Design a protein around this nucleic acid. Structure first.
Lengths: 133, 388, 57, 14
RNA sequence: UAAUAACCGCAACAGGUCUCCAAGAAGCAAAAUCUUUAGUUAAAUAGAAUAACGCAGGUAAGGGAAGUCGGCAACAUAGCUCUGUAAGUUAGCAAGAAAGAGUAGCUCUGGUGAUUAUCGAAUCAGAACUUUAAAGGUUAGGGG
RNA sequence: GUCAUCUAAUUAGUGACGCGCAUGAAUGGAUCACCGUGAUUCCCACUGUCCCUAUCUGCAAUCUAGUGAAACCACAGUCAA
RNA sequence: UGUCGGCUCUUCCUAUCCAUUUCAAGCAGAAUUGAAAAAAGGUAUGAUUGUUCACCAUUUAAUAGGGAACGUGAGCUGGGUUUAGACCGUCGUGAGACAGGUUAGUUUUACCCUACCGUUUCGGUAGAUUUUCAAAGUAUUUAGAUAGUAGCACAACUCAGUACGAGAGGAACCGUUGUGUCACGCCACUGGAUUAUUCAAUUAUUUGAUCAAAUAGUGUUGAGAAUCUAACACGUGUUGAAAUAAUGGCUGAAAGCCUCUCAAGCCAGAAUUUCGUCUAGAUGAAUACUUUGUCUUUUUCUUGUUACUUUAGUACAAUUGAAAAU
RNA sequence: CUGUUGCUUAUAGACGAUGGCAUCAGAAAUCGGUGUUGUAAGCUUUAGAGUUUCUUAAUCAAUACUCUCGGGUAUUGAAUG
């Protein structure tokens, strides 16, 4: 359920990287396990950037979300990445929102700014985003 | 036994052996395939790298999601003062390759060309081309020259002009010229020699050789690094911290029983001064005539291509220049052999029109803020100096 | 663009943007200013800033 | 089975 | 002489060998660091260049054990004052549990005595103001 | 081994079951409070262990003047079958 | 002859997992299954175990099977095994045994030859005589027998909710645009190191105090140019012709018909081969100047080379050697 | 001709090699451009929480104001003259 392509966004989120959950679905933090579309290499850890759909497990949250594996989208990251128009940009924290394969967000609201790359790729996130930075 | 896990080999076997070159100038291995159904023209040039800046260019491709305000890209500035054509040579196709038949030179030759033929000029008698010039107008020598022209027209297939640079126009301390043979691709051998004769003693500027938004091939010698280990040379994996005798090496240099170390293994050695050819490089600004400045249709302030404080380790560019998108092989002051593309690129990005929106001229040292020193003075205002 | 701490006019293709969780985004001209911003240093007490020079004289 | 160790240090008394 | 050259180790060997006298700073401290009296500047040779691979000491964006037999190595906590401190228990402990706050400079205020107004001790508490907001140069617990 | 629990994932750890190849009572059985440069597992924090390598310093290595060994050595030293 | 595994690294096999090209199906579409050409390119991340093996959780176009002294210890590790300490269980009267379990246990030497990777020094290729010529020396411009060889893969838009199908479902060729990796580079912009002990601040000690420093082997902290560098920044490898393999065909006999040929003759067809292109490179060629014009050997000067100097000896213009194809 | 040698030479570099100039050579200052840090030392400089001695003027005082966009550094592998 992903629309269009994405430019190069340097991936600052690894395997076992912990991110916040900006949704309101009782899940606090998710730790990245794998990244959808990742092309494997020897000894390389999976990498995720803004707008990258990941597979993550919830280690902190309500019982219906903890100790389970969900699917998320990185909406902001602390890694500095460069836009194609010579704009260097980075956020304050790494966060994600739970989506399914078809792309519809599980939650109903997002707290904090949402990067443009995650907003363009997923139309459902941009509809519920406060601001698109 | 088989290796447990598979991975691509480190380093290319197409660039083996890694032998450092002897001359700074790099000779092109070929010229674009000749077509006999067009006017004669030169298929190459030669310039000196100045430095690197960045430009904001307006995207002209369609069906692309690039920003509409412009894309930040790097450029390389290659100062290319005019060349002096000082002869020409015809090549014949034999069963062992092209064989130079004769070389015909002009009457007047500059000391920059004569410096190539010695190794201690200040102790030489500097009598190069003396007999060729003194007896240029004699009846016997004129007949000989007329035979060289007719011999080439009869028994030759390739004609090249021996053009050399003028190093009094560049900030380099070297005085001897840089000779390069530029093949003439065009009409029949009859009209190729006619064009080559017309160029004798004349000057060729880069605007005549290259067009606008043209993709070219660049051949140059890379930046030297010296003796380097396997980690830098090839990119092997560093060994664990626990390792005895060192970390930055290849653990296994071959199996027991080919009984010899293979040429395919990574060994420490020279990295650096190699000759590399890069193809399909677009021209952004043809710095000839009006476009010798750095202003654009959107940014109209009057400024030259040299950043504030001069190009680092190079100086000030005040002659014709090229604006090549991206990087070329070699550091500043290197000699770059340009060339028309052997395989012309047909991609939509190769045919795209280049519209520069901003050309950077801020100082290439530190975190600069001002484009021109006049607008540095305006913003800062009068200081303690020049006020008292 | 103008720098968030120093107040200098930011040259094109030079600088880093910082986005906070309170929907506030700032752009800085170099790492020298950005670290000053993160240490909660007032540009009014930093002599070389454009903010300081505009307040005094 | 197959073991591996060796060391000696006398080296005469010259 | 009594030892980084006079003793024992093949030697002018980074190993070993019992004692006496013992200044200032700072500090709880004979600690670390600097110095005065005394001793020495030589103690298995140097000069130039500043490649790889090393031995010793370091730092590093984003992520944080995914590396590995295994947090091996390194990082991190670290002084003092005040508050606060669990399960378990042989009722003595655990316990510096865990956890949180304060700390600088300058100008002041007050408490703790002796001799019968004069004289004296470092110690504790408190208040304005200032700044680059304070144990951290050195020494200096990771916890459950 | 079977059931729970720890993890996304547990030949690991812990709590239980016990026809236990071949446990068991001063060859001591069961029990752990304090203690341990003892063996094992899990959390928090921190980090070049790692993604994935970059870079700085000293001493060497390099070259030179002086000085100057040892192990080893049938003869020696390019490959395929 | 250092005995398991893992780590690092290269190469080789095909009995092929993916990508490319084909044939077949009980192949309507999609997903599949059997088979041929083809080994040039890829084939991953983790929990448990010393494990090879195995089993789970993901991801991917695929996460194929193997060899090289069961590849690889003067390459690493020392987890297991496999000495010497100690414990439990069974066995033995006892010392002691245990493919029974547990715990702690020194990993030495390359400066030799070769190989491989880079890097120097000396040597040098035989048959032309139109003085507008020939040869030697120095220097530049070039030349290319040979050796290596590099780009791959995926995704999005449109094709298209179209072909196909009752429905459910559900493609592809061209074209466009991006991403990942590999290779070569490079320093503009972003980031990192920083003994320019740069600039500033500051703890302890010492200069009587201020200034200015020094010491704590770089005291420490903040910013920090240059240079180097990014898996952290960014460029190029979208590139052209011919001939092919499996296979599909054309004409066409053999064999009056049929047949793609275990016949002659052709066409189309691959991540294929060869040109083209990139890298290293042997014998070489052209030009500039210095010369020499029948010739050499041995001495000898030079850092070295050529020309050169001396004593001699040798030859002296004039009949040689071409059809092509079949 | 070529090599040594010099520029404590570079676009190069372990050593050789390689590349450039060699009297219109070279090197060094100063000097302008260009960068880094953050406003130098002085004073009869105006703010200063407070204190002391005179008798109400001195003096002491972390910091802070003007001179001061100051001072210092800047090829060492930066660019001019």
């Amino acid at each position: 359920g992903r629309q269009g392509n994405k430019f190069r966004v340097t991936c600052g989120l690894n395997n076992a990287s912990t991110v916040n959950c900006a949704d309101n679905t009782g899940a606090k933090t998710l730790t990245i396990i794998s990244v959808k579309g990742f092309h494997g290499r020897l000894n390389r850890l999976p990498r995720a950037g803004c707008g990258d759909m990941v597979v993550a497990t919830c280690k902190k949250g309500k019982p219906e979300y903890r100790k389970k594996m969900h699917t998320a989208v990185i909406i902001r990251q602390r890694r500095t990445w460069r836009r194609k128009d010579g704009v260097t940009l980075y956020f304050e924290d790494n966060a994600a929102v739970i989506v399914n394969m078809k792309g519809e967000m599980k939650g109903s609201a997002i707290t904090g700014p949402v990067s443009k790359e995650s907003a363009d790729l997923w139309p459902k996130i941009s509809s519920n985003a406060p601001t698109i930075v | 036994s088989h290796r447990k896990f598979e991975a691509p080999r480190h380093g290319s076997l197409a660039f083996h052996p890694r032998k450092r070159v002897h001359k700074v100038r790099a000779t092109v291995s070929a010229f674009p395939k000749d077509n006999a159904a067009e006017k004669p023209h030169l298929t190459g040039f030669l310039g000196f790298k100045a430095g690197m800046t960045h430009v904001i260019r307006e995207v002209k491709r369609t069906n692309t999601k690039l920003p509409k305000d412009g894309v930040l890209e790097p450029v390389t500035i290659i100062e290319t003062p005019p060349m002096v054509v000082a002869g020409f040579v015809g090549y014949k196709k034999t069963t062992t390759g092209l064989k130079p038949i004769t070389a015909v030179f002009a009457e007047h030759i500059a000391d920059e060309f004569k410096r190539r033929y010695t190794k201690k000029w200040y102790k030489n008698t500097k009598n190069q081309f003396a007999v060729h010039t003194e007896k240029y107008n004699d009846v016997k020598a004129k007949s000989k020259r007329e035979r060289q022209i007719r011999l080439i027209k009869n028994r030759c297939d390739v004609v090249r002009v021996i053009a050399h640079t003028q190093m009094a126009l560049v900030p380099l301390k070297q005085k001897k010229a840089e000779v390069m043979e530029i093949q003439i691709n065009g009409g029949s051998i009859a009209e190729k020699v006619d064009f080559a004769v017309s160029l004798l003693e004349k000057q060729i500027s880069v605007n005549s050789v290259f067009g606008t938004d043209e993709c070219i091939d660049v051949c140059s010698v890379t930046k030297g690094h010296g003796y380097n280990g396997v980690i830098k040379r090839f990119g092997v994996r560093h060994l664990p911290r626990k390792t005895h005798r060192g970390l930055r090496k290849v653990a296994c240099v071959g199996a027991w029983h080919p009984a010899r170390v293979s040429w395919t293994v990574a060994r420490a050695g020279q990295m650096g001064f190699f000759k590399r050819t890069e193809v399909n490089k677009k021209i952004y600004r043809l710095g000839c005539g009006d476009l010798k400045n750095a202003k654009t249709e959107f940014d109209i302030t009057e400024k030259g291509i040299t950043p504030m404080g001069g190009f680092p380790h190079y100086g000030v560019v005040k002659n014709d220049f090229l604006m090549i998108k991206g990087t070329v092989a070699g550091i500043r002051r290197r000699v770059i052999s340009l060339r028309k593309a052997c395989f012309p690129s047909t991609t939509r990005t190769a045919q795209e029109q280049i519209v520069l929106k901003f050309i950077d001229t801020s100082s290439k040292y530190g975190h600069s803020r001002f484009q021109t020193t006049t607008e540095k003075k305006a913003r800062m205002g009068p200081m303690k100096k020049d006020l008292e | 663009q103008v720098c968030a701490f120093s107040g200098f006019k930011i040259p094109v293709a030079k600088g880093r943007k910082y986005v906070r969780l309170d929907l506030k985004s700032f752009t800085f001209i170099n790492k020298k200013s950005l670290m000053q911003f993160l240490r909660k240093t007032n540009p009014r007490k930093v002599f070389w800033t454009a903010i300081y020079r505009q307040l005094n004289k | 089975x197959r073991x591996x160790x060796x060391x000696x240090x006398x080296x005469x008394x010259x």
